[PDB]
Amino acid sequence: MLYELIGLVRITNSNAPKLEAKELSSTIGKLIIQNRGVVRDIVPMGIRYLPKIMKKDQEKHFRAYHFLMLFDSSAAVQSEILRTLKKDPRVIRSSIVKVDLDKQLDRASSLHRSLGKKSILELVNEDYQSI
Amino acid sequence: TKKIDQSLSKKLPKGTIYDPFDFSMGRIHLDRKYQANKNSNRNDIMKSGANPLEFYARPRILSRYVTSTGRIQHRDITGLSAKNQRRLSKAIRRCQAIGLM
Amino acid sequence: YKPKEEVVKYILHGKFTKNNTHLTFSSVVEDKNFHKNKGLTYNDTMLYYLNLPQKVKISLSTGCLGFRKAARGEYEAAFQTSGRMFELIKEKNMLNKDIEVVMDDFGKGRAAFISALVGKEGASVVKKVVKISDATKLKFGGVRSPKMRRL
Amino acid sequence: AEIARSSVENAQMRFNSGKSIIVNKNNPAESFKRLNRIMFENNIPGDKRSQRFYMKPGKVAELKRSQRHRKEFMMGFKRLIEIVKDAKRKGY
Amino acid sequence: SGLVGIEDIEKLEDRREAILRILSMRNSENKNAIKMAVELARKEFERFPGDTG
Amino acid sequence: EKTTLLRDIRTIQDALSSGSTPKELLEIKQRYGIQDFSQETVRQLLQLDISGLEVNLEK
Amino acid sequence: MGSLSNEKFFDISLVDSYLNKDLKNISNKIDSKLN
Amino acid sequence: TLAELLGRSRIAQVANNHKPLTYTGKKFHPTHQIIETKPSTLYRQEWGLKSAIPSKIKSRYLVYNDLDTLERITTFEPRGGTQWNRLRFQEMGVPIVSNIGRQNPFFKYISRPEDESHAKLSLFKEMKGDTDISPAAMKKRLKKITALIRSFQDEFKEWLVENHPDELKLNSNKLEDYVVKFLNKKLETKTNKKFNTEIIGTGGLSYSLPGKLKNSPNGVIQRTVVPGRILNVVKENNDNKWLAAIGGFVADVVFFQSPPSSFNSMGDFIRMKTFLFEILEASMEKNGSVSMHARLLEPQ
RNA sequence: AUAAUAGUAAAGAUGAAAUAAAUAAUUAUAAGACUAAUAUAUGUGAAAAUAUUAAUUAAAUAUUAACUGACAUUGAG
Ligand SMILES: [K+]
Ligand SMILES: [K+]
Ligand SMILES: [K+]
Ligand SMILES: [K+]
Ligand SMILES: [Mg+2]
Ligand SMILES: [Mg+2]
Ligand SMILES: [Mg+2]
Ligand SMILES: [Mg+2]
Ligand SMILES: [Mg+2]
Ligand SMILES: [Mg+2]
Hints:
Chain C is an alpha/beta fold. Helices cover 23% and strands 28% of the residues of chain C. The structure holds potassium ion (K) (4 copies) and magnesium ion (6 copies).
């Protein structure tokens, strides 16, 4: 099944804002590819201010690095990833939503589909045929 | 006084045709009565054919259909179809649960 | 490295219930040497300046002006209590920095406080008020309220 | 450091609630009128009153059904009055 | 019509591995497995090709 | 058999374009039974049933 | 174009012509014409 | 038969129109057909519609949408004022000219493919001119077309290897050109939007040909003087020209050097006074509007 | 509810009342229950019921093609 993970990583060090996010993406990506899974895309969303002050593991946060990770894995692996994300102190909020593949095998991230790009081929073919 | 409130004077656009009635107060009142946000459709993503549920990770677009406090606007105000209102409300509720809205 | 407590603004909070009106005047104190402390992260600094400590200066109710029992929740009791507050803010030399007004509920004293602040009684305080806001606390589901009264 | 000092203005107003008004130093009574409009457009006073006492779910449903009907009934009434006025203007 | 060379075989093997992981029955919903079972069962009982009723 | 179709079809198309005849090809001539290594032998190793169906349907 | 297309992302036409001796029976045909 | 007669009846001649009779947006041209009744018929409330128009109506011109409705009334507005705008334009004797120097749309000119060198610009305009098309009916232009275009694959798989084989073996820069031409050549026979709904030229506002001079008892008229009104007392924001109301049209007035002092004096009541203007040129835009340029002739 | 903080003398309740370093304010911690707007229970479900989010499993729609060939309806117990 195709899944779309949206994780809000903590920005502890203002000098290295994109450090825990890279370390976290590698940890999650390794779980997926080591359990028969495929990572289709990793779309960084940048540092954004949280809608409110949020708390996690007896800590407070006012900003986080947003990132999206579209990956293919089994239901059991997807639950394992979610369990690890709900326990990692780095992660402030994490959501995994299923992306239906009943009609087509290649679906882009919701962010891209919102912009009219329904498949990764459309995104790649707009970076080769026109770039 | 050489000044009039904007609400008491009509500014005729350029290139348009007019009648003598367009200088009357009736035109002012008639324009107020029939003043509807009909140009929203062309600027309303959710009235274009996109699925509102694909915007659950884009709080900026979703924030256009909630009040200042975050209350989802009734379909009477948004003017969306039943399906889009249903999908838009789900998107906003999902966005709130993820920690983005 | 040294406590440098300084006032940044004042908060005029009014709680307008059905039976009384409470008016609290507070100072948002900021230790201007907090960033000079050792072992302080960027998050702790930003978190300290996003919710600065507050100190209560004036606390008044309608019973402090002699209104008793049922008269405490009336329009006149709130109007006079608001005046006494606007006077005590000038008699304590607390009208130098900007004031933020926070209203909490919608009892009969809410419109008396507003009238006393947009009128002669609050012609000094209103000049310093920079932001007005509402802080009415609502519940999304939450605890079960008491049963409807059969009267 | 100063990085945490020069980025507190937006941060302070980035976590807004939507129930605040910047007072107009000229007409301070117009800002309180604006705040009241927000309260009424978010039904803050009505919601607070409706949360004072518990109402049974069946009664809540009945009240919601009746209110919707009255809202819809008024829209139908206004539609018919507009037709009357239009008909009168044209001499019907 | 020819006259970027060719892709390394390791890269073409990884494209195959991605396609076989995405299409693995062990990574899909249980309903897909049941759909395959229905086809298998139908073919063991059908009177002729196309007999479904 | 670690040997894969793609790799095997990449040796029958390089040996047929370079002239090399490593014993792997003889083995490949047994893995698939393709004794002769020509451009018209890889095309008959990769034939898909769908192609036959398309012609039966036209008839 | 189908089989005779220049797109990097082609369709099944190209793979069908290959296995149907069309992309080869046309390449020779074009080359024979050039001769 | 009765059906044949009905199709040719005067009511059938009026094209179906459901556009709002009360429109508060920008009006650039007439939207409804004006209906006129004679004085004798007006005396008997006869307009040639289904039902008698109420006697309160004293005008002899109206515009309508529906002959009858569920409210048992006719939907009409007793006004015919777009005709006076057209006749006032005729009295100003300013021919409409093309600012792009295009051929006159009212003459059957022998045109050539000079502009047809943009075959890929307009052949794809059929699928790309979908600014206001449904999200799925516009998507039906993708599969419906693909099948139609995919049915010409065999024809283009032989023509291209018989007319330009070199390009198929060298580069596709020219192949793409042969593709755009192929479809158009195979589409000119087809009928895709064979009827074009775009406004043709002036749209009927003026059928006057430029060139003629106006003879007058005081000699040939060299400059057309028309009374008008200044609407704003401050030039259009972001534009170096004010706005005038001349003959039912809003024009852009250019002043010689300075703005007359009556502007500051009058202020927002400037529209209460009538000035004399000179109509420099009149153009027609694609939206169907008329771009009238004037000049505030001031007594000197 | 508890603790801290300054700040005070009343607070709370009612038709009016009276029974049992506070109230209010700003922080921190804990617990249980509940689910604001959207919202029409529209819809869905056999009924009872069902409206904070996600996931897993199960079921549910229309048309077309092919197939079975009355295999249906109702239903005491
Ligand atoms: K229902
Ligand atoms: K039978
Ligand atoms: K039976
Ligand atoms: K029974
Ligand atoms: Mg009372
Ligand atoms: Mg009790
Ligand atoms: Mg307390
Ligand atoms: Mg709700
Ligand atoms: Mg129903
Ligand atoms: Mg039964």
